[PDB]
Amino acid sequence: IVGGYTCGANTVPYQVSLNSGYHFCGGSLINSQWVVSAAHCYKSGIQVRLGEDNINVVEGNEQFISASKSIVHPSYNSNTLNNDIMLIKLKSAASLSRVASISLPTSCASAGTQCLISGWGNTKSSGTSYPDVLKCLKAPILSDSSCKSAYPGQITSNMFCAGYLEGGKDSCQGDSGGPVVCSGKLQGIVSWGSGCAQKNKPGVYTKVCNYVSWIKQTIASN
């Protein structure tokens, strides 16, 4: 997260860190046993870390649970990045104030809606600086037209842009799979972009409202 602020210990209870010997992606807890993240974060040997604030120090509110299953959307396209969504089943259920699930959306959010994006990714536009604690960013959802103007022929119906055209505030490497929460509902999954916090290049997110059926049914039959 470039241009954000320190969220505060366990103020984003649904945020999880996906660890494979180190933090490589974020994710959101949707119930005691399921996590939603990005399809490009698919990796073998994933350990999910809940109740985290400082990812480098054991502070006592953590729960490390290995994934038993990783289901990438059947239509995920690694080239176009369309359908960049994945469900991870926890080997055992998490104990749910510091660890809590986030609600799925009932409908899609509109341009202009203010959302909270969070993660442990790089905090520099030019350079490298990975934080110890969770960073937060409030960014508005942008119109489909401007999104499409920023990324010609790359935006599908399953993606939305959020951020600032001026640049300076954005998601960055290490934030993928994390939540974009608007009005208490999970509306997006951090996905991709052109560089980080560049002018006229806002971040692109997976539009969660289009997968609610798939998510609910997939969770129930696995």
Partner: protein
């Protein structure tokens, strides 16, 4: 020669540690891969990297 190409992080925002052959140093080094659109000078281990590009 893809072994002489600079490492490519790509547009995705994961932070996955991969290896690339650094012909200037004559060794395989680590770099942050974003998770998608990998070029060929991108390996999962130093051994794979050396086997494919070593000596390029």
């Amino acid at each position: 020669d893809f072994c002489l190409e600079p490492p490519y992080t790509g547009p995705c925002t994961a932070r996955i540690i991969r290896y690339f052959y650094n012909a200037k140093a004559g060794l395989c080094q680590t770099f942050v891969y974003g998770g998608c659109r990998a070029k060929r000078n991108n390996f999962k281990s130093a051994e794979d990297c050396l086997r494919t590009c070593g000596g390029a």
